[PDB]
Amino acid sequence: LGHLLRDVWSLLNEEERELLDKEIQPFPCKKASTVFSEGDIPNNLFYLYEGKIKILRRFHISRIVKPGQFFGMRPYFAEETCSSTAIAVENSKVLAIPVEAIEALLKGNTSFCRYFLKALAKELGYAERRTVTLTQKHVRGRLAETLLILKENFGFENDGATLSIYLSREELATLSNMTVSNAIRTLSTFVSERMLALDGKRIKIIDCDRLQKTARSG
Amino acid sequence: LGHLLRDVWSLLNEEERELLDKEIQPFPCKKASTVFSEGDIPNNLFYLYEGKIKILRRFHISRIVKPGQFFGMRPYFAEETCSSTAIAVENSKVLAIPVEAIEALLKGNTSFCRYFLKALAKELGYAERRTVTLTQKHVRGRLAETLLILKENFGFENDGATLSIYLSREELATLSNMTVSNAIRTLSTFVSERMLALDGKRIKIIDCDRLQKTARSG
Known about the structure:
The PDB classes it as transcription. The structure is a homodimer of 218-residue chains. With 218 residues, the first copy, chain A, is α+β, with helices and mostly antiparallel strands.
């Protein structure tokens, strides 16, 4: 199963690949189940092969993990407990790598180290950007930004306009630092302005260019 | 000058130490000068030997760097431009390490890699925590939290109560996601409640236990 970790697998030699194949475990992950909980001591790193995982800690959703990313990596490297709970947004295929195996691999392989260095640096860039967005942008900018981030990370359905992720109003509100009332109020306005169209949990972006202007300008 | 980087120097062998000593440069850093600017392409990593550096990008102050920390490391590892401007809060002694030298060292040394892995993971933990604080805590909690963070990172003067950092009201307000009016209003109340005492830019913590309760409870 180690080969499913496409980017990382290419960095490993034959002995390292054997070790990974030996230690990696499938991790059952039904929608709404929890991978780990805030306060937990890290025993594994997790790789999201398929599906979607929300990281949360009012609650705050710090990220929604997309396929091909690692999670639970932060507290391992920081030598801390998990700051957050990880919950599946949909049925997901997760691979667990024991921290002992991770550590052996890191010790022998600077390329493997540098992969995680980039991953953490990227996450930190996103995190610091998000702080500015959430504290400084007004309701319209915050929600538009959230929607464009989901567009970027999860993409569109076959129609090329409907977001391929189906968050509750509560998740969308929390993600964008607003009340559900404000979220539904703002979505309503975005439909009135013909930037979006709504159908249950389905959000269709009908004017992306203008939505982007709203994210940036207000 | 490489030996001044105490933690890192201990991880390096003789050849690596020679390379570091050869490539490291002193970097003049007067109060109010800028080390690098938002949008800059990384040419060096910077190590704060002595002094204090604010990282900023309304402006947002993402951190105040303390002695013994690296900065400008994020965009190097992420392969991005600088997201922020770094400005000295006081006369500082900064050491610059060319990214070419950094890269050679990382390639040969997993311990060196793992040092930065921990540093980035720590920073990410602080960043994600700060997002929750700044978006969810009320004015009293936010400012108390800010003050306790400065206490932790910069400590006390000889009196064991006066913070050893002397930020403007504007810096303190920005750091804590409030208007200067709200900051000065809240400081005024903290003095009325005998948690603080104020003397220009000097902030004296006279009831730390209660300040901590205020940070946590409101």
